[PDB]
């Protein structure tokens, strides 16, 4: 799954975490998620 989000949203995307992105934008299941890989893309923007 590919998407672009800010640094705080990087923390937000974790299993069972609650946040504005976590509540509505994207939710991880209450089960193991394989891996989460995040890096800043400011140069790409």
């Amino acid at each position: 799954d590919s998407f672009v989000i800010r640094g705080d949203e990087v923390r937000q995307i974790a299993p069972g975490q609650t946040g504005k992105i976590a509540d509505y934008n994207y939710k991880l299941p209450d089960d193991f998620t394989g891996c989460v890989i995040a890096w800043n893309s400011n140069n790409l923007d």
Binding site: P15, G16, T18, D30
Partner: protein, 49 residues
């Protein structure tokens, strides 16, 4: 107390059932004993523990 042994049997069984029911109120190391309350005021991942 002529019928000591039989009364003792009855008392022992009542004691066992009573302590079994009392154990429900015990906290057991969780935040609260009542299960609906622990469900209500925590997120499911944390409430699971």
């Amino acid at each position: 107390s002529a019928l000591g042994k039989l009364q003792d049997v009855v008392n022992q069984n009542a004691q066992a059932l009573n302590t079994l029911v009392k154990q429900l109120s015990s906290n057991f190391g969780a935040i609260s004993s009542v299960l609906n309350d622990i469900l209500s005021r925590l997120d499911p991942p944390e409430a699971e523990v």
